[PDB]
Design a protein around this nucleic acid. Structure first.
Ligand SMILES: Nc1ncnc2c1ncn2[C@@H]1O[C@H](COS(=O)(=O)NC(=O)[C@@H](N)Cc2ccccc2)[C@@H](O)[C@H]1O
Ligand SMILES: [Cl-]
Ligand SMILES: [Cl-]
Ligand SMILES: [Mg+2]
Ligand SMILES: [Mg+2]
Ligand SMILES: [Mg+2]
Ligand SMILES: [Mg+2]
Ligand SMILES: [Mg+2]
Ligand SMILES: [Mg+2]
Ligand SMILES: [Mg+2]
Lengths: 834, 245, 336, 49
RNA sequence: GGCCAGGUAGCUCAGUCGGUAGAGCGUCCGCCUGAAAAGCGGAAGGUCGGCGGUUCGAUCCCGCCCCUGGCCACCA
């Protein structure tokens, strides 16, 4: 089970004690409940049924034999001494049982018309119904059996089952444990409708039973967090007694299966009042009851029969013989009530909320009791819930309530359970709301929710009730006023914001890079931080490559992928094969996202108290403990870079496309870069450039190594680029160009160099020699014909000269060209082509 | 003259990022600024300074990615709300910021959930801020992303780091199963414990905050019933949106 | 709290960004037309571009006409740059023009001791000439420079059509191009640009006589669109990514040489229906197998279902429906 | 790997326009908005009013 | 964390309880076309999720584990 379920009729009945005649539509109730802060998950009407659906009594059972299943032909008394034969395949009933039959002419939900049918060689005048088939509850895998005396045969089924009802499923927030009960939800509705509320846990509704002496003996170990622990016996109950239909019906509608009166009553009163209750067979108890911590390795067997591995933070209830319960989580089988139990010891205890939560979550037992205790339970009502349970059980099952009572209230005894008072200015909710509430609203709302309120000038002294431990500061009181008045009254006013500075330079640069890559034909992906399994082995990185130093997730999505990415390429490359695998063979992807690069101090910082600002040193320590998380930009390409069309067959991706991607990013960042040959997996060592901004390395680009492509299932020819954006300085150039009105001179120069000399190094050498007259140099020819020796290449550059103050002669330009050729000779060994 | 002429077809930024850009511009035009925070975060800022009790069940390993070793108190952040803390620690008052970035949870995938997603955080802290200012900001946010014909609703809720707390739903016409109110994000007045954990006096300053799903915003805005294509990175999802927006 | 940039304001930035990224350099164009430009263009005497607002006291006595088109100023700037050594040039501008009408005249003084009434406000605005935002571009010389990769590509009319598509993508609208005659463009290399069925401008290679008479470089191409006639748009796409595999087929159709390739592709889309995921022209053939004044076009087709794997016969049925649609709308004959 | 790679060199928006865009961003970030007016104008608005 | 069904080719799936395992689409080739696709003909491609074990031999049997989809559960 999971959320707070309850039927409207019970809710209405508790509301109507103080507000006689109160009744709303389920539509209206759902709206009211949402408005004051209770999420309605489901509104589930019961039924509906039409036509002859009535109570019957099973008067005889004939077993039909020789079928794939046991089958019963049943004589059913349907009233007025009229008997019908009905074929039924269930087994969970005997002669004399009250059942619900749908005779022919009946309509069951949803839309099932019942007609007389031939079943297993016999005629059946209808069917015996299960609870699911009546839309009354989930199934017990058999048909529904009303307890003896629920109704006479022939009674109207819909009336008897109460099928007009509607069940609300609410998802109560964790700060409202008091709403895990009819008591708290009824209180809330009385607040919303300004009704008078009669508390079902008050002494006028549950008058105290006698206290003439102590019940069972009890010890409670210090520092177990138990706040209250009360015990009262009911002696001499009839074990053949079953709970009346009205009680079984309400348990069922609340999602709880009825079993026996002793257990049924504790579940009922838990639902009604919000205090979990537990029934012990007092005659299976041996000696003093004690609550203590489990020991290491201690197991206990819960009443469902599973062996629970216990831990030392877990609170037990034990006797001399065995463990009786995991405190506020689940009872043990040793004192469970049985079909022979006659003398019952009822336990109303208040456990530590955090302890119950820790324990129930480890053991995965989110029982009805445990999820109330972990949201806190009103300790003021323990004996009232005990007395309610005892009286009800003695009435249902023929007991006598014993006038003894053990009521441990801590050491020393606590007798006033109210939270401490809260001082708040009377107009504080108005200011937080932005609304001028009518005078007295705050005092009136706070009194409705149960607080005691006194006035001193503009100051209220507000003492919350014991079922509202969440009410600790003025803001908690504000929330109470605002939600009950309704958020709809709060107006909509944009704040004047001061003048901001807009996007930072880095945020602006990210937009520009992404727009430029997109325009150039790259599609963005949002890469997963979780590296592929063994990716760096697939890449073939040495054992001490910095990329291997990764931060590790303890509990990853895929156990094989615990490592956080030091590089975006593994996720981009994975996205590339996904797209290629689905028919998009020409692909160009990019990502701009942080990576995660731990270091030495990348470890833990203990809890800093949150009642104060961390000091500046504590702030800087926290930040130094985290891994470095620089922003990176990366791209991958495969297939055709340019598509085919009427103009021709299109161009395959090549390394220079990855180099051009670097230049698109650099132009977008307004920095200049240089590319230098480098060896760096996973790139092809002869088609890899390291990228520099000034003399600082910022990344790498080129074609991937053939073996990486091979081992990773990548398309042949795949290229890639990855840059560290945080290493690219934030430039802001302020050019002031002066345009020369004089004509330029054009000359070309062909230079022969060793084959391994980069062309850019020749252009740099030419520019260093040519001087200020050189306006532009552009390579337009790389030639390696037979005129050129082996391992040498001829380069021809177009040169453009221009002076700021004069027309040049050819001889002016030739002298600059000559000094450029000399500079190329001295720096890269160039020979003027001859 | 109608022959194809695009020798290098356009690509596309991801629509989540284009939506983030548009949300940012909306708030910058109101004078707010865009704050940032790391994806690997301390527990101190993701849980403790945001007023989560020590045993809060969102802290368990079933709910939150933790960084090795066992108790580094490091994690993948589970909401953008730690940026409230970093901002109030780093900036002087008053503060008017949003933050947009990735958040991480150990969630099952369904039509409106994925383990790695994005949120838009908002935080305003100043003298005299009220719930009316929260509502004004949320209405401007919704009106800019969904238009004026957008049905929203605000109802009281709970977060450990706000009091009062509220949730905002959007009427989602294309919701798988039939149109219904779907939650858009959470909001409230900043809890006084959160101000005290950052050295701000709750008697002088009040604040509001909110946190909306970014993919969730895109689902409402473009009527995409199932978010998983949005997450998986197939080029076919992104190209229809265009190189820019 | 302000609302930031308007849609029109954002779109102007995006167009600017995109054209500059594509190699175009912005000029801020003078509004004073060159002396007798429309005579050098050879425009008809009733061409609407000749209905210009005139400045009483201009900078140059021979240039009193205010521009109804940005091309004269861009083309003058082109000649200026080419004359100073930069022969490979691409320029754009985004600027208002001035287009008077009948009601373009004076409005008498209105007393400034009160607010002008709403009728006077509207009469003042109606008395001014129309001043829509235009975007325009010109190119000459090499579109793509030479380098190690070979000798580079001269500007051609298709570069002007691509500039239109750069602008349309930036504006997030679809355009269609249709053959047109419209000076100063070459009547055989001129497109009129359409958004929906609204004309927004023209693009292509300039007429050789206009080039000769204006001293422009051989092959100069040009674009001019009316931005204010391009509607704003806010597309809200919701793609669904089919996990199933696709089918690839090609189709060769023969049409009369005057049928635009895009009208064939549209007919193929029309006939093929929902399975068609993509269509791309990749061959235009007019060799000796093809009759005179006809052409063979071949398109790559990609079919894909949202809920199943297709058979080759499923795509073939869709292809055959496309073939029939093409015969019915453009007279296409399946290549044989 | 140092060979020239840019097959279509970048262009440029005019610096006056880029400066206007940056000035507009500055004021939008303060909550202000960008208003427009035509280049051919009435004497009523250029002078009299 | 619970329950159910699964993991087999580049994609979507059928199937097999010891020695051969497949279809639709995707890839490649021949005829064909100027070049294509279709059509006709012919190929390639799987460590049947992983690691141990049993066995002369394992997709299939035994053990441990991992992941995927759905329905629940939990929650900032
Ligand atoms: N797994 C998920 N996948 C996609 N989107 C998600 C996922 N989980 C949450 N969201 C979206 O994120 C929104 C907020 O998430 S939340 O868990 O409900 N609440 C928070 O995270 C709070 N930090 C929001 C908040 C509340 C109050 C003040 C500031 C901020 C949701 O309303 C969804 O729109
Ligand atoms: Cl040589
Ligand atoms: Cl022909
Ligand atoms: Mg509260
Ligand atoms: Mg010479
Ligand atoms: Mg979760
Ligand atoms: Mg699962
Ligand atoms: Mg919630
Ligand atoms: Mg085929
Ligand atoms: Mg598969």
């Amino acid at each position: 089970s999971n959320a707070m379920r309850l039927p409207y009729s019970w809710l209405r009945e508790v509301v109507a004690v103080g507000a006689s005649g109160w009744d709303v539509t389920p539509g209206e109730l759902e709206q009211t409940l949402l408005r004051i802060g209770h999420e309605v998950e489901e509104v589930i009407p019961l039924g509906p049924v039409d036509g002859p659906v009535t109570v019957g009594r099973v008067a005889d059972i004939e077993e039909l034999t020789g079928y794939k299943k046991p089958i019963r032909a049943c004589a059913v008394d349907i009233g007025d001494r009229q008997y019908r034969e009905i074929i039924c395949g269930a087994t969970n009933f005997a002669v004399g049982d009250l059942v619900v039959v749908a005779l022919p002419g009946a309509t069951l939900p949803g839309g099932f018309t019942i007609s007389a049918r031939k079943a297993y060689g016999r005629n059946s005048d209808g069917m015996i119904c299960s609870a699911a088939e009546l839309n009354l509850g989930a199934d017990h895998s058999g048909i529904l059996v009303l307890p003896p005396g629920a109704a006479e045969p022939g009674a109207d089924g819909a009336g008897v089952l109460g099928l007009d009802d509607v069940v609300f499923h609410l998802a109560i927030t964790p700060d409202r444990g008091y709403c895990m009960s009819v008591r708290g939800l009824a209180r809330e509705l009385a607040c919303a409708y300004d009704l008078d509320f009669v508390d079902p846990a008050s002494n006028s509704r549950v008058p105290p039973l006698p206290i003439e002496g102590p019940a069972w003996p009890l010890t409670v170990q210090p520092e177990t967090g138990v706040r209250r622990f009360a015990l009262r016996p009911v002696i001499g109950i009839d074990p053949a007694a079953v709970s009346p239909w009205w009680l079984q019906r309400r348990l069922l509608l609340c999602g709880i299966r009825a079993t026996c009166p002793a257990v049924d009553v504790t579940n009922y009163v838990m639902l009604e009042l919000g205090h979990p209750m537990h029934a012990h067979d007092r005659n299976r108890i041996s000696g003093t009851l004690g609550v203590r911590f489990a020991r290491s390795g201690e197991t206990a067997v819960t009443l469902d029969g599973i062996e629970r591995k216990l831990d030392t933070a877990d609170v037990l209830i034990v006797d001399d013989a065995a463990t009786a319960a995991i405190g506020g989580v689940m009872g043990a089988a040793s004192t469970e009530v049985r079909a022979d139990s006659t003398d019952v010891l009822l336990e109303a205890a208040i456990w530590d909320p955090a302890a119950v939560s820790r324990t129930q979550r480890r053991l995965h037992l989110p029982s009805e009791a445990a999820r109330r205790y972990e949201r806190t339970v009103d300790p003021a009502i323990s004996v009232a819930a005990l007395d309610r349970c005892a009286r009800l059980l003695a009435d249902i099952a023929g007991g006598e309530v014993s006038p003894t009572l053990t009521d441990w209230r801590g050491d020393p005894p606590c007798d006033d359970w109210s939270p401490p008072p809260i001082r708040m200015g009377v107009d504080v909710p108005d200011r937080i709301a932005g609304v001028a509430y009518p005078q007295g609203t705050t005092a009136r709302r706070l009194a409705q929710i149960g607080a005691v309120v006194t006035h001193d000038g503009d100051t209220l002294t507000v003492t919350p009730p014991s079922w509202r431990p969440d009410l600790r500061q003025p803001a908690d009181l504000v929330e109470e006023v605002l939600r009950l008045e309704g958020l709809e009254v709060i107006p909509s006013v944009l704040p004047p914001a001061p003048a901001g500075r807009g996007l930072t330079a880095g945020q602006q640069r990210r937009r520009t890079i992404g727009r430029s890559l997109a325009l150039s034909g790259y599609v963005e992906i949002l890469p997963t931080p979780f590296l592929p399994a063994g990716v760096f082995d697939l890449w073939g990185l040495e054992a001490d490559d910095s990329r291997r130093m990764t931060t590790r997730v303890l509990n990853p999505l895929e156990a094989d992928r615990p490592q956080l990415a030091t590089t975006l390429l593994p996720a981009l490359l994975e996205a590339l094969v996904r797209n290629v695998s689905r028919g998009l063979v020409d692909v160009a992807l990019f990502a701009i996202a942080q990576v995660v690069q731990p270091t030495e101090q990348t470890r833990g910082v203990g809890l800093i108290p949150v009642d104060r600002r961390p000091t500046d040193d504590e702030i800087a320590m926290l930040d130094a403990s985290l891994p470095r998380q620089p922003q990176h930009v990366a791209a991958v390409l495969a297939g055709l870079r340019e598509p085919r069309g009427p103009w021709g067959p299109g161009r395959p991706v090549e390394a220079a496309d990855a180099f051009e991607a670097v230049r698109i990013i650099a132009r977008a960042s307004r920095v200049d870069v240089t590319l230098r040959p480098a060896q760096y997996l996973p790139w092809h060592p002869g088609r890899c450039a390291q990228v520099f901004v000034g003399e600082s390395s910022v990344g790498h680009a080129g074609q991937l190594h053939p073996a990486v492509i091979e081992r990773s299932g990548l398309p042949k020819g795949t290229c890639a680029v990855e840059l560290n954006l945080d290493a690219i300085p934030c430039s802001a150039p302020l050019p002031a160009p002066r345009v020369s009105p004089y004509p330029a001179v054009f000359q070309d120069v062909s230079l022969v160099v060793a084959a391994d000399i980069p062309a850019q190094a020749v252009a740099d050498a030419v520019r260093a020699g040519a001087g200020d007259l050189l306006e532009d140099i552009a390579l337009f020819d790389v030639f390696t014909g037979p005129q050129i020796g082996e391992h040498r290449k001829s380069l021809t550059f177009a040169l453009r000269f221009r002076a700021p103050d004069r027309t040049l002669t050819e001889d002016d330009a030739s002298a600059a060209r000559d000094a450029a050729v000399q500079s190329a000779a001295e720096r890269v060994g160039a020979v003027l082509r001859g | 003259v109608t022959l194809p002429s695009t020798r290098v077809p356009a690509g596309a930024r991801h629509p989540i990022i284009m939506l983030a850009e548009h949300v940012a511009d909306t708030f910058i035009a109101m004078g707010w600024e865009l704050a940032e925070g790391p994806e690997v975060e301390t527990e101190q800022f993701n849980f403790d300074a945001l007023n989560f009790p020590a045993d809060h069940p969102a802290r368990g390993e079933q709910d939150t990615f933790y960084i090795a070793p066992e108790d580094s108190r490091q994690l993948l952040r589970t909401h953008t709300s730690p940026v409230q803390i970093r901002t109030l620690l780093a900036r002087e008052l008053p503060v008017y910021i949003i933050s947009i970035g990735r958040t991480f949870r150990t969630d099952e995938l369904d039509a409106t959930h994925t383990p790695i997603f994005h949120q838009v955080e908002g935080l305003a802290v100043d003298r005299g801020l009220s719930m009316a200012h929260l509502r004004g900001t949320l209405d401007a946010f919704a009106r800019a992303e969904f238009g004026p014909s957008a049905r929203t609703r605000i109802r009281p809720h709970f977060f450990p780091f706000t009091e009062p707390s509220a949730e905002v739903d959007v009427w989602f016409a294309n919701k798988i199963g039939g149109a219904a109110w779907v939650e858009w994000g959470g909001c409230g007045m900043v809890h006084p414990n959160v101000l005290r954990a950052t050295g701000i006096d709750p008697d002088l300053y009040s604040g509001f905050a909110f946190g909306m799903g970014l993919e969730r915003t895109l689902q409402f805005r473009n009527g995409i019933p199932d978010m998983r294509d949005m997450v998986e990175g197939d080029v076919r999802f992104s190209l229809p949106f265009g190189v820019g927006a």
